[PDB]
Ligand binder design. Structure first.
Ligand SMILES: O=C(NCc1ccc(NS(=O)(=O)C2CC2)cc1C(F)(F)F)c1ccc2c(ccn2Cc2cccc(F)c2)c1
Ligand SMILES: O=C(NCc1ccc(NS(=O)(=O)C2CC2)cc1C(F)(F)F)c1ccc2c(ccn2Cc2cccc(F)c2)c1
Lengths: 303, 313
């Protein structure tokens, strides 16, 4: 599918709070579709979806999520709890004069669009997650009940991930059958091969983006487990009553399809897609299959 | 009507050419409506329209026109001929992935949206001008032959020196209701200035606040008046380009809004536009001078929304 060249995009900036500006690229007219990337990614992770969604008759806003790229990256952990991130995305809609948008998220972006659908359904026309399930919060078990624990203490994972940005992205952005991960990178190649999914130029784009703020903002997404759980518990097991799509990836070994298995109970209008031979990096692993699932769903449930 | 606070808008940037970025503010969803200000103004000249149009179900893009604000202001006169400006607005639509927009312009922005409708009808859903008529180009007379102040504006550096000398005085002197006007535009050249016979500390017009004036002052500190005055410095090139369009009509929905008390872009200059623009509708605003959007913002909003809702959506 047709990709994006960053020099050639419309770049938008909204100040959602005194020290906090969100960057997005914008393409197309029609219903507003807000794309929300995961860890550790970029608006550019949607490069195969932005043109296809615009061409299908949608107004695509592909965010740099807070902590990333040209969006503000404050260091404080609590700036990256779902409650703060969601309230900022509502403010974003407010300043853009959008009564609602479709929210499509992947990974930590997926977790955010579920929270948006849960707490701000009036602002969410329809919700779609790649890989990330929605599990109702259990008020009995703290988030406690290695790599996510390694990510907890500020400064540690940052030092490993920032040491060599080319190595970081070449090591992470791999098809499931190419994976070099069980530090994160202690027992992994020092000069990893290029994955079949990505080019040198695409890797160099992520390297240039992550030179702006590095990994503190991105890693802070993982450091709010207790805050996110407390906020989720306040949702009093209400249902999500808006059109919803859950897309599972067969070969995502972290966000495994089975973890989505009971979401119909809590999300009555849930549709599903499933992409075979697809690992964690869904948009760039199976961009054609993603585009067909998203557009088929948008055209039927959102337009 | 509700105004805009600049800190609180979505700011967009598109590169239309190597050295040329266009800035806009964006508000609302629905059909794309691109607002094009005149001389010497700002996206902010639409401050009363942006909220009202967004609220009426439109996606408003209020430009900084080339030469202004956060948009690039290259010094070359020919960067500001209608042919270059139009091709840049088409590239702007391209990069935003808009197949078409409604184009609403005032003053020099109005001149641009007529040229857009004329040369890029496929990219223009509908066209509206405040004050600026569409006159077919006469291949017999250069606009040189056809307003001394416009000759004063020709020579690079001259009008710039007067307009940049005191930015607060410039904007307080320009942005006035017709009955408040302190400018004679008649013998500018012989007098040798727009403001030579105008108060040194002009009173604030009833139309604007100190804060609004201070916003235009801040904007015009980035590039000054060269880019804006270059809009005036392409009379021969704009006329030659316009002649190349001779005999082709504008067949898209069109609105002409005249201002009773605009003494330069006088309503009578619009008087024969039906001949060349069969689908033309009209508004007329009484007691309204040149600065239409900020003089009669309520009347402007009603005319534009009534027209958009009937002819454009
Ligand atoms: O670590 C996470 N994702 C990134 C990831 C995923 C897979 C992979 N790779 S892979 O090929 O699958 C495997 C071999 C390495 C790589 C990464 C990364 F390297 F970037 F770390 C992640 C963790 C928790 C998340 C989310 C989103 C939400 N949570 C909360 C939540 C809570 C409850 C249920 C649930 F499913 C998730 C994301
Ligand atoms: O000088 C012009 N506008 C600015 C203006 C207008 C009125 C006023 N003020 S006033 O209140 O009316 C008067 C008492 C002072 C002030 C200004 C300014 F101060 F900024 F210079 C202008 C000139 C030609 C234009 C345009 C747009 C297109 N043309 C080409 C074109 C060619 C052929 C026919 C035609 F109608 C216009 C604009």
């Amino acid at each position: 599918p047709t990709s994006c060249n960053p020099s050639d995009m419309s770049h938008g900036y909204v100040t959602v709070k005194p020290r906090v500006r969100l960057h997005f690229v914008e393409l197309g007219s029609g219903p507003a579709v807000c794309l929300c990337h995961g860890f550790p990614e970029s608006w550019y992770s949607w490069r195969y979806q932005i043109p296809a969604l615009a061409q299908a008759g949608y107004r695509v806003l592909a965010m740099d999520m807070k902590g990333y790229g040209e969006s503000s990256a404050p260091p404080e952990i609590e700036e990256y709890c779902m409650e703060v991130l969601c309230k900022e995305m509502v403010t974003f809609l407010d300043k853009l004069g959008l009564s609602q948008a479709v929210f499509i998220g992947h990974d930590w972006g997926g977790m955010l669009v579920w929270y948006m659908a849960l707490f701000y359904p009036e602002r969410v026309r329809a919700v779609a997650s790649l890989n990330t399930p929605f599990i109702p919060a259990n008020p009995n078990m703290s988030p406690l009940e290695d790599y996510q624990l390694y990510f907890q203490e500020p400064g540690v994972a940052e030092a490993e991930l920032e040491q060599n940005l080319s190595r970081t992205f070449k090591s992470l952005f791999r098809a499931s059958d190419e994976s070099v991960l069980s530090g994160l990178f202690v027992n992994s190649p020092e000069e990893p091969s290029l994955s079949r999914m990505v080019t040198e130029e695409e890797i160099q784009f992520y390297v240039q983006q992550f030179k702006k703020s590095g990994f503190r903002g991105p890693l802070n997404w993982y450091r709010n487990m207790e805050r996110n759980w407390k906020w989720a518990c306040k949702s009093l097991g209400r249902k999500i009553l808006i059109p919803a799509l859950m897309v599972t990836a067969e070969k995502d070994f972290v966000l495994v399809p089975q973890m989505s298995q009971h979401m119909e109970d809590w999300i009555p209008h849930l549709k599903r897609g499933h992409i075979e031979d697809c690992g964690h990096w869904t948009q760039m692993d199976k961009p054609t299959e993603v585009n067909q699932i998203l557009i088929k769903w948008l055209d039927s449930d959102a337009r």
